[PDB]
Amino acid sequence: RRDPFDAARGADFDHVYSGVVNLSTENIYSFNYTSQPDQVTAVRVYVNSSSENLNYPVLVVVRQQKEVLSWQVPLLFQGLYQRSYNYQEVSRTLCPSEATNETGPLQQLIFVDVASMAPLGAQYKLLVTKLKHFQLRTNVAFHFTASPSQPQYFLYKFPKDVDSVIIKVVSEMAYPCSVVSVQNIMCPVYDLDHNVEFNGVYQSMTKKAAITLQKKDFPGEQFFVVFVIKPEDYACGGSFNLQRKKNLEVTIVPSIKESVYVKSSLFSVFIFLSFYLGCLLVGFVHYLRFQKIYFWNIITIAVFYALPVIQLVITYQTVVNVTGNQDICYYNFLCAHPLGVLSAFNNILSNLGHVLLGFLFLLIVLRRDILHRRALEAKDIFAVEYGIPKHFGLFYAMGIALMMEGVLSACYHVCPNYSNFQFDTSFMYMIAGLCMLKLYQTRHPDINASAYSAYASFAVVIMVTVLGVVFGKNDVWFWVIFSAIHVLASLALSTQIYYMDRMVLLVVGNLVNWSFALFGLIYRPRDFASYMLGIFICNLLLYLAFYIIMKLRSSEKVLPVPLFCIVATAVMWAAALYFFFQNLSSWEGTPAESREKNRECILLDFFDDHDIWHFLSATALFFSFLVLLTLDDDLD
Amino acid sequence: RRDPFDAARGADFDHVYSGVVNLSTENIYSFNYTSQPDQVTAVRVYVNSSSENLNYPVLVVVRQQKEVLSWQVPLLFQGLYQRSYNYQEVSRTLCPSEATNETGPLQQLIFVDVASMAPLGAQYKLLVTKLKHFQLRTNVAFHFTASPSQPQYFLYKFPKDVDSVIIKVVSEMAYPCSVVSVQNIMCPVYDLDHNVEFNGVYQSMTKKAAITLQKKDFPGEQFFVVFVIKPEDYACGGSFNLQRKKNLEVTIVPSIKESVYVKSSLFSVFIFLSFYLGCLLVGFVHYLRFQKIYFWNIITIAVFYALPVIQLVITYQTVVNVTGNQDICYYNFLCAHPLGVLSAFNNILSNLGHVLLGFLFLLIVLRRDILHRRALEAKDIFAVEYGIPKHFGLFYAMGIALMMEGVLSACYHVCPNYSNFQFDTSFMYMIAGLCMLKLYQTRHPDINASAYSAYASFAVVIMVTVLGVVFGKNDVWFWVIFSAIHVLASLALSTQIYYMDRMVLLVVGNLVNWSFALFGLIYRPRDFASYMLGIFICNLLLYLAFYIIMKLRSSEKVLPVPLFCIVATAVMWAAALYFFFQNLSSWEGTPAESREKNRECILLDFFDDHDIWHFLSATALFFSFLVLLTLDDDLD
Numbered sequence A, B: 001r002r003d004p005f006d007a008a009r010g011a012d013f014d015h016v017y018s019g020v021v022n023l024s025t026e027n028i029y030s031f032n033y034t035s036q037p038d039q040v041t042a043v044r045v046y047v048n049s050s051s052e053n054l055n056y057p058v059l060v061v062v063r064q065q066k067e068v069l070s071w072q073v074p075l076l077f078q079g080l081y082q083r084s085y086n087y088q089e090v091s092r093t094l095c096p097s098e099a100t101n102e103t104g105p106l107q108q109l110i111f112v113d114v115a116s117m118a119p120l121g122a123q124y125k126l127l128v129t130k131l132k133h134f135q136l137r138t139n140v141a142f143h144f145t146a147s148p149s150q151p152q153y154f155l156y157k158f159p160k161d162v163d164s165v166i167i168k169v170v171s172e173m174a175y176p177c178s179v180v181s182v183q184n185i186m187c188p189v190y191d192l193d194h195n196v197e198f199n200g201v202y203q204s205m206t207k208k209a210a211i212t213l214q215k216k217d218f219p220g221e222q223f224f225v226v227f228v229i230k231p232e233d234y235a236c237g238g239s240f241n242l243q244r245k246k247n248l249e250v251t252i253v254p255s256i257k258e259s260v261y262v263k264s265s266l267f268s269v270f271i272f273l274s275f276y277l278g279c280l281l282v283g284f285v286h287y288l289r290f291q292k293i294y295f296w297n298i299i300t301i302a303v304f305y306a307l308p309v310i311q312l313v314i315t316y317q318t319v320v321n322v323t324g325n326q327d328i329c330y331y332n333f334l335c336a337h338p339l340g341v342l343s344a345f346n347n348i349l350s351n352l353g354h355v356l357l358g359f360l361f362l363l364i365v366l367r368r369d370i371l372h373r374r375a376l377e378a379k380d381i382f383a384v385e386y387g388i389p390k391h392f393g394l395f396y397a398m399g400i401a402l403m404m405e406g407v408l409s410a411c412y413h414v415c416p417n418y419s420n421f422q423f424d425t426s427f428m429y430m431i432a433g434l435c436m437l438k439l440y441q442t443r444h445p446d447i448n449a450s451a452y453s454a455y456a457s458f459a460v461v462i463m464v465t466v467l468g469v470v471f472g473k474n475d476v477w478f479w480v481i482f483s484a485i486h487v488l489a490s491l492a493l494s495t496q497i498y499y500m501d502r503m504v505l506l507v508v509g510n511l512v513n514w515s516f517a518l519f520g521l522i523y524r525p526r527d528f529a530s531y532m533l534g535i536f537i538c539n540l541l542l543y544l545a546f547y548i549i550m551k552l553r554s555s556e557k558v559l560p561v562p563l564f565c566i567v568a569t570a571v572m573w574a575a576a577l578y579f580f581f582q583n584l585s586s587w588e589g590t591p592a593e594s595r596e597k598n599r600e601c602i603l604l605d606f607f608d609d610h611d612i613w614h615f616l617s618a619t620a621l622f623f624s625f626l627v628l629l630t631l632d633d634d635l636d
């Protein structure tokens, strides 16, 4: 019978053994070592077959006390479109075993067998090395390299006090894709292409990756971090001595404490309660100085828009929480602090203003309308020859739209995805349309188009946006049709509004044509909803400026409060647009590329760009509504 | 150096070798064989270690010309909640290599090494057998068994003419879950627990599985079918000499031809064009004898309900087509014939009636209303003393609701899922509500409650159903609250309708109470939408029956046409309810259990139960609308 000790070559690590194997010859080595308590040893085996022989690959088998590994040196990879790749260098890290004080020192023996079947012979070069840079320490960086045939992984241990950690992986050249996974300390370790996704959380990456881990999940307070490169780049982007070495740096940082949550919640509440306090102060000062269809329409639309998206997001959040695959939601993982089951608590809590300011506007408008109704009940002719008709439902509709926009934004931000690209700024379309309607009605007679003209406009706009996003991704005929429709609509609106100021119509038409040429030359926004939002904002601001300049030309003085509100609205809009143009993650494109643009939070240790955008949008919209309400105070 | 031939034991298949291995001993066998053209050989290796030693398992390594396999005899499995399982028998099928005429007969050698590290010794029993039942033949069944540590797989070759095939797998006892996968002929073959989902389509199963394959996808017109059992049953259902042997039967059947598509399309078109032909003939015979809000409301609801679900189903269909994981959509895979990119063509084409019948009803109502308007223009006092007020909006609303319910059902059936349980019968809620409103208005004065009463009713009903399904799955407090609200609503409706027939209110209340007791004792419908549909249908039929009986008690003769329409409506309702009660697949429950209840098509070779349900529902609704329209013809 075969005797390993008899034919084994008592060998030592770090010596590059070389050999040649025939059909009737096999080589075996008998490495030995010892492990001591409080230390972790991880052996690594490198095998390079100098020859390129492919019909008779060299077969390598590593035997330990309780595990067996095996592979070939000329590793062969098969890729789509019938492509073949051959790698002539292979490496593997053996699963380590801990040694406790009770167990004491442990002696370990490892056998390595190299054998082939070539009739003439195949060369091989074998190296076995120990690992000193195996463990990882919190806050200390680390650099290394990986290859499609040389997967890597390391060990981390939970400190005494840390209850949550973040793993950040950074690279420079994103040519070959990669996968980063976290697993428990239970051999075997799945560090292969076809089994790395079986267990533990994982993330595909090309230039950036971030994973947040708690403590209660892992027994023993330790885990393995595995990095695996991929033969082809189809999954994470474009198309595909062969080698694809990729350099990586890995950092582990403790997570924030609950004190940050308390601070952020208190700040968010109080910053917006200050507005109510100021309104109460102003009302007190004024008192001292003195000393329909929209309802059910909005209710139905809100329920219709809420139930489906709400259930869809519930299901997506549950699935992402259960399966552990962090490639479904398009979060901004660098700053996403979870609470309870929620995965991104900040992005939802940052929507408090959209509700609070809407509530304040509703309260103020209701009080003003009730006061005007009481005054009319008392009757006064000063509001007839020196007054204009008053309407109330429009402002309530605007405020309810603001509330619904806030709730929709929160629901969408629960888990962003390509199927929820709308519901993020959808209701601001309605807000802009309502402001347009209010401006149109205030100057000209009522001539109300009931309420369904705006409904049809919104339905058509959503139709066109969805059609363009889902189909107009790469086509231009639809783009030409949309441009023609937009130009025709602009001309028709200009003609209708027209019937000293004969050049404003030409100015608006020329601005629209300039935008037409701009995106025709650029011809690649790829975000139809964003451009629709921008165009609505542009038209609203243009109409507001035209109306204000016309009022100025009419030789009347504007009350100071409308002027202050105008300036505040302008500044807030500027800031909000600045924070909006910043891009963090995007539903379009593969998840690996979406995370390629992430940032590590601004302001406090909680918020980031998008939260500031939410805040500034809420404030700017509130000030615009107040300006619209109060602009015509001097007329009475 | 090590010499394989020197220590190799020239062995033969089917002989159960036995041995004992120590630290310094390792046994090797050197099996040999030859492969001839037009035949496929697949060796299989069984290894059983009699001892239960966990600390010192036996290591087995199989070496071939181009592949190496390795494993341990006492296989260890880790399961959730810190559970461990050990299997003492292992088996494996080597990847076969085809032998072509040009290549000629091919000699093959296979080395098997058994080695351990026990200080005393470990026993082992090894068997190597050839496979004669490896290939699969079309339409011929096959029985076999599998175990968590003994995965199986077989080969299939595409016949000359078959362009599409179906693989059906059947079992009897669904205790241990299983996975069935299809892969190409390219070694290695992933038949392990942690890598079986990497490549090729796959399906989790417990009692039934079905997979449809085309021909152009596979080069060589051949493929491997792999069956893998699972250590635990958490994924596919409940909780978890150890063994879990599972018996399976596999059949392969050629798919249908395009002639079936042509036949089914022509039949579906003509069966429903027959209604228009009959209406035209009736109009011809009659001629020979003679010889606003709803619009915009429904149009807005159309987009508001279509765009989210339409885009969402687009995304699901694209993803399921791309990845190849057949566990997202809850189809009925036994009868799902795809066309182009669509995966279930029949379930969509079976919705032609919901549109055609609605269009016919709209046309007939428009013609009748226009004729009545012309007659009124001519003026006739007969329709005053012996006439009743005429209305038209409700009938148009009903027709549009039907025409939109058809499209909603089609969109939902594009890819059924737990996030789309509505949109299958939602619009018929509004249909029943409108029928009730029309019945209320026809007898009592107009007293139109505008149109938003039913709007709020529908919104509240949908909200309640969604809340119950998402949350009231295992709770009873919500169920008690819902029952109390239903009883209160029934009492209020009876009181309002009341103000010879003093017992009808008691009868309706008692029927509602009987339903209360029924679903309280059963207390497990777990389909809130289904029971909402049932209750709405029951109330509609109940009110219609009481109205008709009251009219009968009024001592007037009913025109034969309304009687015929009533009888046809009753018969169609009975048939539709019968076809509805049949259950094929269900979004609730794991996908493995959902496919556990599937059926192999009825009627032609295309349709099944659900399509017949669609047809019968459309016909019954159309006849009910016609009955409502024509019920009071005798009055004039």
Ligand SMILES: *[C@@H]1O[C@H](CO)[C@@H](O[C@@H]2O[C@H](CO)[C@@H](O)[C@H](O)[C@H]2NC(C)=O)[C@H](O)[C@H]1NC(C)=O
Pocket (backbone or CB within 6 Å): A020, A021, A022, A023, A024, A025, A119, A120, A121, B001
């Ligand atoms: C086996 O490998 C060796 C390569 O070193 C070759 O065979 C050797 O041939 C020489 C010359 O006759 C002998 O002195 C050695 O004893 C042989 N060794 C062995 C292990 O066979 C050859 O490449 C291989 N064997 C054959 C038959 O080609």
Ligand SMILES: *[C@@H]1O[C@H](CO)[C@@H](O[C@@H]2O[C@H](CO)[C@@H](O)[C@H](O)[C@H]2NC(C)=O)[C@H](O)[C@H]1NC(C)=O
Pocket (backbone or CB within 6 Å): A016, A046, A047, A048, A049, A089, A125, A126, A127
């Ligand atoms: C197999 O090939 C690789 C690369 O072809 C060899 O790696 C070399 O390692 C030395 C050691 O410092 C470096 O100086 C060389 O630069 C490396 N090669 C290259 C191309 O950079 C490796 O030694 C070969 N053999 C084994 C067993 O790995």
Ligand SMILES: *[C@@H]1O[C@H](CO)[C@@H](O[C@@H]2O[C@H](CO)[C@@H](O)[C@H](O)[C@H]2NC(C)=O)[C@H](O)[C@H]1NC(C)=O
Pocket (backbone or CB within 6 Å): B020, B021, B022, B023, B024, B025, B119, B120, B121
């Ligand atoms: C090796 O296996 C054998 C069991 O078959 C044991 O060692 C044998 O011991 C007898 C008695 O001294 C010798 O005659 C044999 O030559 C030995 N065989 C071998 C392969 O060493 C024992 O179980 C194992 N070896 C040890 C050291 O325990």
Ligand SMILES: *[C@@H]1O[C@H](CO)[C@@H](O[C@@H]2O[C@H](CO)[C@@H](O)[C@H](O)[C@H]2NC(C)=O)[C@H](O)[C@H]1NC(C)=O
Pocket (backbone or CB within 6 Å): B046, B047, B048, B049, B089, B125, B126, B127
């Ligand atoms: C390992 O154990 C299994 C079962 O424990 C053995 O399988 C037996 O095979 C014979 C051959 O027909 C059957 O008659 C027995 O019924 C099987 N066992 C049982 C429990 O049913 C097997 O022979 C053992 N060894 C190997 C190498 O498989």
Ligand SMILES: CC(C)CCC[C@@H](C)[C@H]1CC[C@H]2[C@@H]3CC=C4C[C@@H](O)CC[C@]4(C)[C@H]3CC[C@]12C
Pocket (backbone or CB within 6 Å): A310, A314, A317, A318, A341, A342, A407, A410, A411, A414
């Ligand atoms: C009433 C309005 C203001 C609420 C707006 C925020 C809503 C959308 C938020 C607040 C609380 C959230 C829920 C809190 C907890 C969980 C449990 C988790 O396993 C699934 C998601 C689910 C069910 C969340 C879904 C989104 C949610 C309902």
Ligand SMILES: CC(C)CCC[C@@H](C)[C@H]1CC[C@H]2[C@@H]3CC=C4C[C@@H](O)CC[C@]4(C)[C@H]3CC[C@]12C
Pocket (backbone or CB within 6 Å): A339, A340, A341, A342, A348, A349, A351, A352, A355, A406, A410
């Ligand atoms: C405009 C909105 C976002 C403002 C915040 C209001 C709502 C959404 C907030 C207020 C209090 C919050 C809850 C506070 C505590 C918990 C318990 C935790 O285990 C799950 C999340 C859950 C249930 C939170 C979900 C979101 C929540 C309901």
Ligand SMILES: CC(C)CCC[C@@H](C)[C@H]1CC[C@H]2[C@@H]3CC=C4C[C@@H](O)CC[C@]4(C)[C@H]3CC[C@]12C
Pocket (backbone or CB within 6 Å): A530, A531, A532, A533, A534, A535, A537, A538, A539, A541, A542, A545, A577, A581
């Ligand atoms: C950001 C992507 C979606 C493209 C859209 C950009 C939008 C937000 C930008 C681009 C051009 C901008 C406009 C340029 C000029 C003016 C005139 C000024 O008196 C009021 C603001 C207004 C009308 C701007 C509003 C914001 C605007 C419309």
Ligand SMILES: CC(C)CCC[C@@H](C)[C@H]1CC[C@H]2[C@@H]3CC=C4C[C@@H](O)CC[C@]4(C)[C@H]3CC[C@]12C
Pocket (backbone or CB within 6 Å): A573, A574, A575, A577, A578, A581
């Ligand atoms: C004409 C009126 C409406 C302008 C008021 C809005 C202002 C604040 C907006 C309009 C265009 C915006 C800029 C558009 C593009 C860039 C380049 C980017 O790398 C930094 C931000 C920056 C510089 C933006 C900052 C905010 C910005 C200047």
Ligand SMILES: CC(C)CCC[C@@H](C)[C@H]1CC[C@H]2[C@@H]3CC=C4C[C@@H](O)CC[C@]4(C)[C@H]3CC[C@]12C
Pocket (backbone or CB within 6 Å): B310, B314, B317, B318, B341, B342, B407, B410, B411, B414
């Ligand atoms: C106009 C009305 C009657 C149509 C109602 C059925 C709708 C939902 C059907 C008709 C055509 C269908 C499309 C036909 C082809 C494909 C390509 C596939 O890769 C994604 C789905 C997609 C895009 C289908 C989605 C569903 C679809 C849009």
Ligand SMILES: CC(C)CCC[C@@H](C)[C@H]1CC[C@H]2[C@@H]3CC=C4C[C@@H](O)CC[C@]4(C)[C@H]3CC[C@]12C
Pocket (backbone or CB within 6 Å): B339, B340, B341, B342, B348, B349, B350, B351, B352, B355, B406, B407, B410
């Ligand atoms: C349910 C009701 C509304 C459907 C009635 C409209 C019919 C005619 C529509 C609905 C879906 C459509 C199909 C959608 C997708 C494809 C795949 C394409 O490669 C050929 C055309 C084909 C096969 C379409 C033909 C027309 C079609 C069958």
Ligand SMILES: CC(C)CCC[C@@H](C)[C@H]1CC[C@H]2[C@@H]3CC=C4C[C@@H](O)CC[C@]4(C)[C@H]3CC[C@]12C
Pocket (backbone or CB within 6 Å): B530, B531, B532, B533, B534, B535, B537, B538, B539, B541, B542, B545, B577, B581
């Ligand atoms: C099938 C699941 C969702 C449970 C609901 C079952 C429904 C559809 C069943 C159960 C009880 C049935 C009702 C029982 C009695 C009557 C009175 C009769 O004069 C007309 C039929 C009618 C009105 C039935 C209609 C169908 C019905 C409502």
Ligand SMILES: CC(C)CCC[C@@H](C)[C@H]1CC[C@H]2[C@@H]3CC=C4C[C@@H](O)CC[C@]4(C)[C@H]3CC[C@]12C
Pocket (backbone or CB within 6 Å): B570, B571, B573, B574, B575, B577, B578, B581
């Ligand atoms: C005509 C109107 C009043 C409807 C009357 C109710 C009739 C049509 C319905 C109500 C309950 C139904 C039954 C409920 C359950 C089953 C068991 C199933 O394995 C076969 C069909 C069968 C036997 C159904 C046949 C149709 C049925 C009898």
Ligand SMILES: *[C@@H]1O[C@H](CO)[C@@H](O)[C@H](O)[C@H]1NC(C)=O
Pocket (backbone or CB within 6 Å): A032, A033, A034, A107, A108, A109
């Ligand atoms: C190495 O020495 C012998 C040789 O195999 C081995 O039995 C022993 O366990 C090892 N001890 C150490 C300290 O490496």
Ligand SMILES: *[C@@H]1O[C@H](CO)[C@@H](O)[C@H](O)[C@H]1NC(C)=O
Pocket (backbone or CB within 6 Å): A037, A100, A101
């Ligand atoms: C083992 O002993 C060392 C001695 O310093 C101590 O630091 C360590 O915590 C001990 N470990 C265990 C598991 O007892």
Ligand SMILES: *[C@@H]1O[C@H](CO)[C@@H](O)[C@H](O)[C@H]1NC(C)=O
Pocket (backbone or CB within 6 Å): B032, B033, B034, B107, B108
């Ligand atoms: C079996 O016989 C020898 C023994 O190793 C082997 O070389 C040869 O290829 C095999 N031939 C056949 C016909 O099986």
Ligand SMILES: *[C@@H]1O[C@H](CO)[C@@H](O)[C@H](O)[C@H]1NC(C)=O
Pocket (backbone or CB within 6 Å): B037, B038, B100, B101, B102
């Ligand atoms: C090989 O020869 C046999 C002889 O009957 C023939 O049937 C078969 O088609 C041939 N196959 C190839 C690939 O030439």
